[PDB]
Amino acid sequence: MLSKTILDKLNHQVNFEAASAHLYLQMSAWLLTQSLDSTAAFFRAHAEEEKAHMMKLFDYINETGSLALIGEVATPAPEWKSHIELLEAAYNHELAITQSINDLVDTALREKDYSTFQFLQWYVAEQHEEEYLFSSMLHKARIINTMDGRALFRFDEEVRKSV
Amino acid sequence: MLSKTILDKLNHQVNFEAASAHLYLQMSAWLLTQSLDSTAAFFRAHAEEEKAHMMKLFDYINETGSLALIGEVATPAPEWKSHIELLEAAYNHELAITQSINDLVDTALREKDYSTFQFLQWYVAEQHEEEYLFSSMLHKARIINTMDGRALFRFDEEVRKSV
Amino acid sequence: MLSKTILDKLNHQVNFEAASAHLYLQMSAWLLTQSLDSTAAFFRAHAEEEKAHMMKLFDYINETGSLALIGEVATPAPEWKSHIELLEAAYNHELAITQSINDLVDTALREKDYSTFQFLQWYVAEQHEEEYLFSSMLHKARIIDTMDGRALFRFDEEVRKSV
Amino acid sequence: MLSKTILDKLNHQVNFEAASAHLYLQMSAWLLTQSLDSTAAFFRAHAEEEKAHMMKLFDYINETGSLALIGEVATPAPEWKSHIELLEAAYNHELAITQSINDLVDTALREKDYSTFQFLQWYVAEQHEEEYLFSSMLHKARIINTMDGRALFRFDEEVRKSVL
Amino acid sequence: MLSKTILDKLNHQVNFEAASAHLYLQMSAWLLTQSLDSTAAFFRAHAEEEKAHMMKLFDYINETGSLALIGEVATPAPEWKSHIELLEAAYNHELAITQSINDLVDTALREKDYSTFQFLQWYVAEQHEEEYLFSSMLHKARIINTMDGRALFRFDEEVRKSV
Amino acid sequence: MLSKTILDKLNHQVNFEAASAHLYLQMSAWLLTQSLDSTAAFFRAHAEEEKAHMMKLFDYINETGSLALIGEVATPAPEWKSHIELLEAAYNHELAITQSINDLVDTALREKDYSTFQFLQWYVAEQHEEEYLFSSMLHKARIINTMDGRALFRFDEEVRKSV
Amino acid sequence: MLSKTILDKLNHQVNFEAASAHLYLQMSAWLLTQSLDSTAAFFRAHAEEEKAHMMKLFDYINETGSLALIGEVATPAPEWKSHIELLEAAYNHELAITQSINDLVDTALREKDYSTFQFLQWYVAEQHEEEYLFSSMLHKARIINTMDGRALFRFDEEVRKSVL
């Protein structure tokens, strides 16, 4: 049976993952106005990943006998001036999610709620994959924004085809 | 291409469908605290249906060249005192969705936006199925809440097995 | 070839079977307003059986070289005050159909129309199955209307599952 | 949920489709007395189509929470003096059904019952296929009733075998 | 070659198993007049099992070179005032069959007819299964005859569905 | 629905078919003592046919809403001095069954119980097959009991093999 | 390799899981005397799960080079006055198993026996599933023990058949 401090943080995380899904949907919509159709598709698909993260928390909470709460989710209209600004926002958002998961893990360990600690390892692992994915996409966007960079990528693509 | 009045209403509907998904998730969670597991599963699954309704609007808006907006979605904590009160809320919520769709259809017809009019016919048909589903579930819940009612259903179940 | 007296009775039976189909359709519609969905489905399906009874008579008449006549079919609006009253009506109606078939069989025998006599044996057999079906459904409805009865059926269902 | 005016018209249509099924059964029976066996089979099969039209209305009404009503269906005995007179009756009947559907669509639009309006679009489409089917069958009957017409159809049949 | 005392008892058992089949048929018929269709089907199917018990004794006797005798089988008309009274009769009847088999086994052992002793082990085993089946059905009928009992079974059924 | 006179006769027939099964079982057992193993197998199998005749009547009676009654079945010990005497008894027994079915058919026709009349046509047809079977077996037995007869059959068997 | 304090606790847990299996067998036997056949079958099957929990600990201990010990397992005769009292005992028993596993995890962490810590994560996860299972079964039993409760479940079952 979940302590109140852990419950509140798990419910905060449910709400955070829900907000991520909506954020990525909104990014997708903006990207389509820039004709960045593949990046839009990526964010659309990834919104569906964030919905799965949400549901898995939601279920764990309910299975423990507490009541999961969705809360308020507010998605700001698209401010972004360029695709790089959007990718920076996405990456920082994923860093903040990782922070939140780490806090949650730390507090489960501190309260000796080992059940929540082991449940959260899935998220710790997933956030490693998320940071890798989003940092890497940002890094490429910055490179591809330069002519020297576009030449590097042309070589890399030649290697992908030739060998 | 989309007029501002229609765009604002379509985006309102996007947000309304998003709120429905979250509302039904929240109902599902509450139902699990009552040990109403099958009803909880129904609402969980239906939250996924509302998400599909949302995405289909979202796409139509983006395909027309406008920018779909998710907005703010606020889900109140579970007030419900019984499963009947929750079913009443779900049914009324579906009526309100139908109202909103009808207002949208009416306004498309009035502006001679025939493209949005025909796109919405899917929703007009879907809301007929939704009202049937939720009214019927509420009616049964009220009947099953009385002893006379539980006797009717016992006969109906005998007919389902016997013939 | 068919005598006028036998033709007029066969055409009466065509019309009677048509009226039965419409009756059972109407009963189905009423049962849906009571939320007796399985009973409604039974009466809907059975309306299709009555249509088959009709068509088989209709074809026999036409094959003999006479002209089958549908006539007027009038279905009274739903009077029924309970599902038991409806089942009583259905059972009495099936008794009347059997009476009508028996009169028809008797008159074919009396006129030595052995062809019509043998054609009707299918109906004599079918009406035995109909009476069994409808009497049995009525009997169960009367039993299930009592608390003692619902306890008997709970045991019978335990036997269906256990052995 | 359904307004009374729409409910009454949908129930009228239920009854009208039921009367069509019976009408076409009766036509089938008459056609058999003329040894027009294929035309009889067509009308028999089409009576089954009219039943499906009926049931679909019936179900929509019941799904909305109202009570569908079958009503009285009266089928006059076969008056018809020729197959052409019968085909004219069938075609006019189908024109009347279309009228009745159009009235129903128009009244749903006027009351802003968009749910009934969209449900009826199936019927609007179906009645276009019905008018095409019956008008075309009538037209061919009139042509075939003339010697010049039979010659046209003999050529058309030669094309069906030789090329198409 | 069978002793006269063993032969007479084996033939008595043949007749007893025959009487059981007829008894269970008669019970089946009565149960149908109470609309206990599943219990009726059980007794009908079980009459077939008793016939198989009869035939297996019948064959053993004939294979040893003696002449199996069916004898007189008298089945009283249905006295039963309730399904529980009928189940009590069925259980007691099975207890009497077991007694009769045990007497038969005991006599074979006493006369050192080891062939008949080993043949009868099948029946000893089968009667354990019969007593389990019939005692269990009686017990459940008594429980289900009460409101507290019907609540226990409702929980048990929930466990059958949930886990 | 069944008249008392028809019910009593149907229940008589139930009992008669039951007695036939037991009679043929008893004949089978006697035949085995004469080493007539194939004839014994025929009677054993045919006892199963008589059980089916019984069950079909039993079911019809119950389906009409009356209570089928098995009654007393008494099987005399085997008197038979030869296989021919047994075959004569079997044939005469089948003649008596046919008589009993005919009386039953005649009574149904007289009371205008057309439902029982048509149900019985199956038995009228089956008894034609039964009389053919048993008369033919008796006739062959009488022929084979003579040396002239065994010579005829030796020729017939030659024709079965040669052509 | 295993410290004596960890070894003694792992062997205690081996013995605890063995006792659980026997407890659930004994509950199964009692439930059969009440004609609660499905609940009996559940406890019987679950005794087999507890045996698997036992064997997995037993194997880990042996793989580390220490000697696993079964010990004494004593199963009291069935005291239970109702199925609810039995389900309460089962649930509390599972809570006590969780407590032991948590103590074991906690002491592995203190001693920096990370190997035993990671091995035990399986049990931490499993005991979450166990508590869910048993608490939920208890909660339903309490609800079904009331007439209002049986009415709720009748509705829930209608939803299982009609929609889900």
Ligand SMILES: [Fe+3]
């Ligand atoms: Fe996430």
Ligand SMILES: [Fe+3]
């Ligand atoms: Fe993420």
Ligand SMILES: [Fe+3]
């Ligand atoms: Fe929706």
Ligand SMILES: [Fe+3]
């Ligand atoms: Fe909806």
Ligand SMILES: [Fe+3]
């Ligand atoms: Fe009929």
Ligand SMILES: [Fe+3]
């Ligand atoms: Fe009928």
Ligand SMILES: [Fe+3]
């Ligand atoms: Fe039509």
Ligand SMILES: [Fe+3]
């Ligand atoms: Fe039409």
Ligand SMILES: [Fe+3]
């Ligand atoms: Fe036996």
Ligand SMILES: [Fe+3]
């Ligand atoms: Fe037995």
Ligand SMILES: [Fe+3]
């Ligand atoms: Fe027979």
Ligand SMILES: [Fe+3]
């Ligand atoms: Fe026979």
Ligand SMILES: [Fe+3]
């Ligand atoms: Fe365990």
Ligand SMILES: [Fe+3]
């Ligand atoms: Fe456990």
